[PDB]
C-alpha cells in the first residue's frame, strides 16, 4: 500500500509548493493518477488476500472501500473549487491539505492489519473533519455540529479502546489474521455482554444506529460540500467496516446480543424514511436518507450470513456513490440561491434540462431501480433478513414504499411544476458541475456491469 | 530585581529540586522542598499588587503546612526504625500522611483548591514555573517509594483529580485557571499509574511539561489571560494558530498526537493490573477536557472573533518573539506519536 | 546585541548617560496656540530631540518606509470628518480619539526609549497626560457616549502609570476669542467649523485637571501668548529649573532597566489598548477586519518581518 | 453599530467570460483546468482503469474453480463416486469423545 | 422523537448534568479559611479509612 500512500503524501508538498494559479489543476490531476494506481489492488487472481507487510493488507472488503476513497479525493476538490474562489491563497491550500489528509488516513484505516492501528487512524479523521465543518461551514450552527460530531464519536470510542486493550492483554496481539485463526468461543457471562457492547457501540454510533444518529443530520446540514461528500460516502462506512472486522471475535454472543440493534435498525429505518417526507430542508432530506440506508447495513451485519454481508458491502459502495451525488446536486442549487429550503426553488427542469437528468438518475439509484447495485444490496439484505425471520418483510416492504415517495417527491418538488421565475440568478450549469455528476454516475453504471468487484468477503 | 538577586533566587529555585532528587536522606529531601517554597515566593509576588500578594500568601500557608506534615512522617519513621529513609516495614499510616501532604503540595484534588487561584494571581511565566518545574520535586519523592504506597489512596486521589480538573476547567474563561485545572487533571494520570509503573508517570510528566511550556509561551506572546484576549490572535499573531490548535488537541489526548500516548499507555498498564473500573472512568472523564479545549480552539483558530481598531497599530510593529524553543517544543509535543516505542521504554 | 539584562550587566546603564538636559519637556496648549513653533525652538536651543505632535499617521511614518498608509490601515478615522460631523453614528469621534491616544502612547515610548538609550532630551507637543482634555471636550458637547469615556479611562489606567511623567510642562495659555480667530486665519475649511463651546471645554480641562494634576509631579510653566512668542525667553526659563519633585528622583539603574525593556517592546507598549471590550465604536467584524489585515500584508515591505522582504531590495535572506 | 463590511453582491460568473467553465476566474487557467479533469478523469482513469479491470484474469478463482469443478464432476461420475460427500473431513481422522 | 425526545434524553441531559457539576464545584468563595477547613475533612476521612482497614 506504500505505493498508494507515499504518492498521496506527496500531494501535500505539491499543494504548498505549487503556484497560486496551478494549485487546483496540479493537485486534481495527480489525485486522479493516484486513484488509478489503487486499481492494482483489484489484481486478485486467487483466494488469498493481499498481505503487503506487517502493517497493511488488502481484502475484498477493504479494496472497494480503499478505491472509493482514492477516487473521491479528486471529486471533492472539484466540488470545493467554486465556493472557495474568494479565499486567499493560503486558505485554499489549507483546505486542500485537510482534504488530502483525510484521504491518506482513510486509506491507512482500511488497509490496517491490526485493530489498535485501525482505532488510532479511525480517531485521527476527526481532526481534519472537525476543521472542515467548523472553519468552512456557513451557518452559526456549525459550532454545535462540530461538538455533536466530535463527542458522539469520542464517547463511543473510549469503551472500544478499553475493549481492544482487554483483547490484547488476553490474546497477546491485535492482528486481524491471528485473531481470526485463533478465535475462541466466548462465554455468555455478564462481563462478555459488556465486552460486546464495548466493541460495538463505537461502530454503531458512526453508522449511525437509530437513536444515536442526531449527529449526522447536524453535521451534514452545516458542512461544506466536500464535508458532506466524505461524511456520507466513507466516514459512515468506517462503522460498517469495523463491525465486520471485529465481529469475528465476538461469537456466539451476536446470536442474542444483536436483537436490540436489529430492532432499532428495522424500526429505526422506517422512522427515518418517513421523516424525509416532511423534511423542509433539501440537504436534511438526504442526510436522513443516509440514516435509513445504513439501517439495513447494520441489520444485515448483525445476522452474519453470506448473503447479508454481500448485500451490505454492495450497499456500502452503492450508497457511497449515490449519497455523494445527491449532496453535490443539492449543492449546485445552493451555490445559486444560497437557500437549502426544498420548496423555495421549483420547476428547475425548465432551465437546467441536463442537470435535471442527473437528478433523475441519482433519484432512481436512491430508490434502488434494478439492475443498479443499489437494488442488489437492498435485495440481498432482504433475502437474508427474510431467512433470519419472515416478518421482517413487513417492515422492509413499508420502507421500500416510503423510499419511493421521498425520492420522487424530491424530484417532483424541485425539478417540476412551474419555474420560480423570480430567480434571475439561475446561471447555466458549469462544465465543472456537470463533470462532477458524470464522475459519480459513470462508475456506478460500470460497477453494475461487473458486480463481482463489490461482493465482499463471503462472496 | 538586580542581577545579584536573580542569580541567587533563580539558582535556589533550581537548587531545591536537584537536592530533593539527588538525596538519599529524607531530611535532605525535605530541605529541597523548603528551598523551592522559599525562593519561589519573591518571584510570585514581584509585581506587588493586591492579587499577587494574596497569591503568594495562599501559596505560603498551604505549602508550609504540607511541609510540616511531610516532616512529621520523616520523624515518626525515624522513631520507628532509627533510619532516615522509608522502608518496607515503615508504618502504614506514616506512608499515607506523606501521600496526602505531597498531593497537597502537587495540587491534587481534593487538596487542589489553592492551585487555580494561585496560578490566577501571578504572571504567566511564574505560572509556567509553578505548573511545571515545581512539580518534579514532590513527584521525585513519590517515585522513590512507589512499592510502599497504598493504591486505594492513590486511585481515589487520581479519580478525584481527573473529575475535578475536568469540571473545574469547563467553567473557566481565565486562561490561567484553564491551565491550573489542566494541571490538576494530568496529575491525576501521573498519580493513578504511580504505584504500578513509575516510568509511565515520568512519561506523562515529560509530555505534559513540553505541552504546557509552549502553551504558556503562546499566551506570553501577547499577554493574553482571557478567552476573549486569546480570540484576537488571528489579527495579532495568526502564524500561531496552527500550533496552538494542535497543542490544545494534544493536551486533550486526541490521536494521533503525542498527548494520546500518555493516556493510552497508562490505561493499557492499568488494565494489565486489572484496574478496569478506575481506568474506564478516567478515560471517560478525560473526554470533558477535550470539550473545553475544543471550545478554546473554536474561539481562536476555527472562527474569527470581532477585533478592535487599535489592533491595527499592533500590526505595524515588529515582534521579536517567540524564541527557537517554542517551535521545537511545539513540534515534539504533537508530531512524535510515531516514536512512541522509543518513549515508553 | 539587543538591549537586555546581559547588555546592562556588561555596562549599558542609563545613569551614566544622563546630564542636565536629559529631560522630557512637553509643550501643551489649545488649538493654534503656537505649540509647533515653540516646541521646535525649545528643542533646537537645548540640543533636544523634537517629536512633532502624534497624529493619525504617527505609526505609519515610524515603520515600514515611513510613508502614510491608506486610512483603513491607519485607524479608519478622520479629523476632517470629526469637524464636519462630530456626532455621526459611525463612531468616528471616539474612534479618532481612541486611535490618537494609542499613537501618543507609542510616541511617548519612542521618546522615552531615545532618552534612556542616549541621554538626549526630548520635547513633545502634548502627550498622553494632556490627551484627555480632548476626550473631555468631546463628552461635554455630546460627541461621544458615556461608555466611550469609560473605555478611555480604562485604557489610560492600564497604560499611563507604567511610564515616568515629563520633567517639565510648558502650557501656553491663549484665550478662546483669540484662539477662534487664529483658526479662522489658519485656512483649513474643516477646522473652521469647530464650535467655540468645544474650544472652551478644552481650556477648562487644561486649567481644572491637567495643570493641578501635573504640578504635583512636574515643573509647570504657564506662558501667555506674548511671553511664548519669544522662544528664547522660554528656554532661559528652562535652563534654571531645579527639578525637585516627581518620580524621576527615585530612579536608579535597575528601575530604568525595566522601563527600557517596556518601551523598546512596542507590542508590549500597545498591549492594553487592544483589550477585548466591545464598544461598537471601535469594534470591527472579522470580515472587514480580515479583509484589511490581508490587504495590509500585501503592501510593499509589509509582507514579512523587516529585513526579509525581497521586494524592497533586501539581501542575504537565505542566510538571515 | 459596529464597523463591518456590507455583504458582497450577486455576481454573474458569465458576465465577463461567456465561456467560463466553472474552475477559475482567469480564462486561460480556467480552460486548462477543465481539460485536465476530462483527460485524467475520463480519458485515463475511466478508460484504462475500466480496461485494466476487465482483463484481471481468474478473478478470485471464479474461473479456476469452475474449471476444477468440471474436472471433479467428471472424475467422480465415471469412477462411480458420489458427486459430493456428506462429510467434509474423513471420519477416520476424527477421534470423537467417548 | 428526533427533534425533541432523542435530544432531551442523550445529548441534552448529558450537557445539563455536566454543566450542573461544573457549577457546584467551581463556585468557591476564595477564602483560605474555608479551603483548609475542607483540607481538614479530607485528612480525617483518610484517617478513618485507614482505621477501618487495620
Amino acid at each position: 500500500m506504500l505505493k498508494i500512500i507515499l504518492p498521496s503524501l506527496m500531494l501535500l508538498p505539491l499543494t504548498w509548493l505549487s503556484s497560486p494559479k496551478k494549485t487546483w489543476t496540479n493537485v486534481t490531476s495527480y489525485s486522479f493518477l493516484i486513484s488509478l494506481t489503487s486499481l492494482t489492488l483489484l489484481w486478485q487472481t486467487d483466494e488469498n488476500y493481499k498481505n503487503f507487510s506487517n502493517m497493511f493488507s488488502s481484502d475484498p472488503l477493504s479494496t472497494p472501500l480503499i478505491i472509493l476513497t482514492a477516487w473521491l479525493l479528486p471529486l471533492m476538490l472539484m466540488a470545493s473549487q467554486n465556493h472557495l474562489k474568494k479565499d486567499n491563497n493560503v486558505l485554499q491550500k489549507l483546505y486542500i491539505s485537510m482534504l488530502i489528509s483525510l484521504q491518506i488516513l482513510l486509506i491507512m484505516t482500511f488497509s490496517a492489519t491490526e485493530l489498535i492501528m485501525f482505532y488510532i487512524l479511525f480517531e485521527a479523521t476527526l481532526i481534519p473533519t472537525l476543521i472542515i465543518i467548523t472553519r468552512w461551514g456557513n451557518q452559526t450552527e456549525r459550532l454545535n455540529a462540530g461538538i455533536y460530531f466530535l463527542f458522539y464519536t469520542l464517547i463511543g470510542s473510549i469503551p472500544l479502546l478499553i475493549a481492544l486493550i482487554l483483547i490484547q492483554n488476553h490474546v497477546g496481539t491485535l492482528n486481524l489474521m491471528i485473531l481470526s485463526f485463533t478465535t475462541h468461543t466466548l462465554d455468555a457471562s455478564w462481563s462478555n455482554n459488556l465486552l460486546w457492547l464495548a466493541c460495538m457501540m463505537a461502530f454503531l454510533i458512526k453508522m449511525p444506529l437509530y437513536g444515536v444518529h442526531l449527529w449526522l443530520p447536524k453535521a451534514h446540514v452545516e458542512a461544506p460540500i466536500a464535508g458532506s461528500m466524505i461524511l456520507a460516502a466513507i466516514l459512515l462506512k468506517l462503522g460498517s467496516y469495523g463491525m465486520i472486522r471485529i465481529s469475528i471475535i465476538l461469537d456466539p454472543l451476536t446470536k442474542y446480543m444483536a436483537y436490540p440493534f436489529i430492532l432499532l435498525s428495522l424500526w429505526g429505518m422506517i422512522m427515518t424514511s418517513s421523516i424525509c417526507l416532511r423534511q423542509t430542508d433539501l440537504k436534511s432530506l438526504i442526510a436522513y436518507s443516509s440514516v435509513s440506508h445504513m439501517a439495513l447495513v447494520i441489520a444485515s451485519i448483525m445476522i452474519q450470513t453470506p448473503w447479508s454481508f454481500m448485500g451490505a458491502t454492495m450497499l456500502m459502495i452503492a450508497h457511497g456513490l449515490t449519497s455523494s451525488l445527491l449532496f453535490c446536486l443539492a449543492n449546485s442549487n445552493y451555490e445559486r440561491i444560497h437557500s437549502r429550503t426544498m420548496i423555495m426553488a421549483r420547476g428547475l427542469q425548465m432551465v437546467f434540462p441536463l442537470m435535471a437528468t442527473w437528478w433523475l438518475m441519482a433519484s432512481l439509484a436512491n430508490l434502488a431501480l434494478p439492475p443498479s447495485i443499489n437494488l442488489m444490496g437492498e435485495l440481498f439484505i432482504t433475502m437474508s433478513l427474510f431467512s433470519w425471520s419472515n416478518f421482517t418483510i413487513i417492515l422492509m416492504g413499508i420502507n421500500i414504499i416510503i423510499t419511493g415517495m421521498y425520492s420522487m417527491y424530491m424530484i417532483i418538488t424541485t425539478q417540476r411544476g412551474k419555474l420560480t421565475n423570480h430567480m434571475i440568478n439561475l446561471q447555466p450549469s458549469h462544465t465543472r458541475e456537470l463533470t462532477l455528476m458524470a464522475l459519480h454516475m459513470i462508475p456506478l453504471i460500470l460497477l453494475t456491469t461487473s458486480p463481482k468487484l463489490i461482493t465482499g468477503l463471503t462472496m | 530585581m538586580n542581577p545579584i538577586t536573580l542569580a541567587i533566587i533563580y539558582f535556589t529555585i533550581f537548587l531545591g529540586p536537584v537536592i530533593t532528587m539527588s538525596s538519599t536522606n529524607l531530611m535532605l529531601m525535605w530541605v529541597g522542598l523548603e528551598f523551592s517554597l522559599l525562593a519561589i515566593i519573591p518571584m510570585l509576588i514581584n509585581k506587588k499588587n493586591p492579587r499577587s500578594t494574596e497569591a503568594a500568601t495562599k501559596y505560603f500557608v498551604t505549602q508550609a503546612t504540607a511541609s510540616m506534615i511531610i516532616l512529621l512522617a520523616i520523624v515518626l519513621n525515624y522513631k520507628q526504625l532509627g533510619t532516615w529513609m522509608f522502608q518496607q516495614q515503615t508504618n502504614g499510616l506514616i506512608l499515607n500522611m506523606t501521600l496526602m501532604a505531597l498531593s497537597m503540595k502537587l495540587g491534587l484534588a481534593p487538596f487542589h483548591f489553592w492551585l487555580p487561584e494561585v496560578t490566577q494571581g501571578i504572571p504567566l511565566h511564574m505560572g509556567l514555573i509553578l505548573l511545571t518545574w515545581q512539580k518534579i520535586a514532590p513527584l521525585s519523592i513519590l517515585i522513590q517509594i512507589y512499592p510502599l504506597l497504598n493504591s486505594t489512596i492513590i486511585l481515589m486521589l487520581a479519580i478525584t483529580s481527573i473529575f475535578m480538573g475536568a469540571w473545574g476547567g469547563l467553567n473557566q474563561t481565565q486562561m490561567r485557571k484553564i491551565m491550573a485545572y489542566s494541571s490538576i487533571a494530568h496529575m491525576g494520570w501521573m498519580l493513578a499509574i504511580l504505584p504500578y509503573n513509575p516510568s509511565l508517570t515520568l512519561l506523562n510528566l515529560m509530555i505534559y511539561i513540553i505541552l504546557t511550556a509552549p502553551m504558556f509561551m503562546a499566551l506570553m506572546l501577547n499577554n493574553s489571560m482571557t478567552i476573549n484576549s486569546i480570540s484576537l490572535l488571528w489579527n495579532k499573531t495568526p502564524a500561531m494558530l496552527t500550533m496552538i490548535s494542535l497543542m490544545l488537541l494534544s493536551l486533550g489526548g486526541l490521536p494521533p498526537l503525542t498527548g494520546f500516548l500518555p493516556k493510552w499507555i497508562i490505561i493499557t498498564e492499568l488494565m494489565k493490573n486489572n484496574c478496569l473500573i478506575m481506568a474506564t472512568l478516567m478515560a471517560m472523564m478525560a473526554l470533558l477536557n477535550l470539550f473545553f479545549y475544543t471550545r478554546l480552539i473554536y474561539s481562536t483558530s476555527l472562527t474569527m472573533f470581532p477585533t478592535n481598531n487599535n489592533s491595527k497599530m499592533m500590526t505595524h510593529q515588529t515582534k521579536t518573539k517567540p524564541n527557537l524553543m517554542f517551535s521545537t517544543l511545539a513540534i515534539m509535543s504533537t508530531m512524535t506519536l510515531p516514536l512512541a516505542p522509543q518513549l515508553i521504554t | 546585541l539587543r538591549y537586555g539584562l546581559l547588555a546592562a550587566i556588561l555596562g549599558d546603564k542609563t545613569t551614566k548617560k544622563l546630564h542636565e538636559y536629559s529631560r522630557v519637556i512637553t509643550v501643551d496648549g489649545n488649538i493654534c496656540s503656537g505649540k509647533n513653533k515653540l516646541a521646535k525652538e525649545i528643542a533646537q536651543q537645548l540640543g533636544m530631540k523634537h517629536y512633532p505632535e502624534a497624529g493619525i499617521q504617527y505609526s505609519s511614518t515610524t515603520t515600514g518606509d515611513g510613508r502614510p498608509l491608506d486610512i483603513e490601515f491607519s485607524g479608519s478615522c478622520s479629523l476632517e470628518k470629526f469637524y464636519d460631523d462630530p456626532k455621526s453614528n459611525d463612531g468616528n469621534s471616539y474612534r479618532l480619539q481612541s486611535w490618537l491616544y494609542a499613537s501618543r502612547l507609542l510616541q511617548y515610548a519612542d521618546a522615552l526609549e531615545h532618552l534612556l538609550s542616549t541621554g538626549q532630551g526630548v520635547v513633545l507637543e502634548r502627550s498622553i497626560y494632556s490627551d484627555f482634555v480632548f476626550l473631555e471636550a468631546m463628552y461635554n458637547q455630546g460627541y461621544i457616549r458615556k461608555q466611550c469615556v469609560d473605555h478611555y479611562n480604562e485604557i489610560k489606567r492600564l497604560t499611563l502609570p507604567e511610564y515616568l511623567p515629563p520633567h517639565a510642562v510648558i502650557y501656553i495659555d491663549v484665550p478662546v476669542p483669540e484662539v477662534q480667530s487664529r483658526i479662522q486665519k489658519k485656512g483649513d475649511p474643516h477646522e473652521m467649523k469647530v464650535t467655540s463651546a468645544y474650544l472652551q471645554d478644552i481650556e477648562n480641562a487644561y486649567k481644572k485637571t491637567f495643570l493641578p494634576k501635573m504640578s504635583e509631579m512636574c515643573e509647570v510653566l504657564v506662558y501667555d501668548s506674548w511671553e511664548a512668542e519669544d522662544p528664547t525667553k522660554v528656554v532661559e526659563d528652562i535652563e534654571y529649573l531645579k527639578y525637585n519633585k516627581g518620580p524621576w528622583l527615585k530612579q536608579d539603574d535597575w528601575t530604568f532597566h525595566y522601563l527600557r525593556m517596556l518601551v523598546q517592546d512596542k507590542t508590549e507598549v500597545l498591549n492594553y489598548t487592544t483589550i477585548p471590550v466591545y464598544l461598537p465604536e471601535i469594534t470591527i467584524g472579522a470580515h472587514q477586519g480580515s479583509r484589511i489585515y490581508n490587504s495590509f500584508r500585501e503592501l510593499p515591505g509589509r509582507k514579512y518581518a523587516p529585513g526579509y522582504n525581497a521586494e524592497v531590495g533586501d539581501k542575504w535572506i537565505w542566510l538571515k | 453599530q459596529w464597523q463591518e463590511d456590507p455583504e458582497p453582491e450577486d455576481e454573474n460568473v458569465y458576465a465577463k467570460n461567456p465561456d467560463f467553465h466553472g474552475y477559475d476566474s482567469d480564462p486561460v487557467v480556467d480552460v486548462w483546468n477543465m481539460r485536465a479533469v476530462f483527460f485524467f478523469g475520463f480519458s485515463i482513469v475511466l478508460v484504462f482503469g475500466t480496461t485494466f479491470v476487465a482483463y484481471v484474469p481468474d478473478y478470485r478463482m471464479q474461473e479456476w474453480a469452475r474449471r476444477e469443478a468440471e474436472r471433479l464432476v467428471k472424475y467422480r461420475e465415471v469412477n462411480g463416486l458420489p458427486i459430493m460427500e456428506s462429510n467434509y473431513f474423513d471420519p477416520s481422522k476424527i477421534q470423537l469423545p467417548e | 422523537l428526533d427533534l425533541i425526545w432523542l435530544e432531551k434524553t442523550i445529548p441534552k441531559s448529558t450537557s445539563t448534568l455536566h454543566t450542573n457539576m461544573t457549577t457546584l464545584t467551581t463556585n468557591q468563595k476564595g477564602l483560605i479559611k474555608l479551603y483548609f477547613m475542607s483540607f481538614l475533612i479530607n485528612i480525617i476521612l483518610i484517617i478513618i479509612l485507614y482505621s477501618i482497614n487495620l
Binding site: 456557513n138 451557518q139 444560497h338 | 474563561t173 482571557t226 476573549n228 470581532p306 | 472579522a286 470580515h287 | - | -
Partner: peptide
C-alpha cells in the same frame, strides 16, 4: 449569503467571570 462569523453578542458570552 456569507459565512457567519461571531458578532458582539456571541463574544460577550465569554466575557464573564465564569462560563
Amino acid at each position: 449569503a456569507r459565512q457567519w462569523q461571531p458578532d458582539i453578542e456571541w463574544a460577550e458570552q465569554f466575557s464573564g467571570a465564569v462560563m
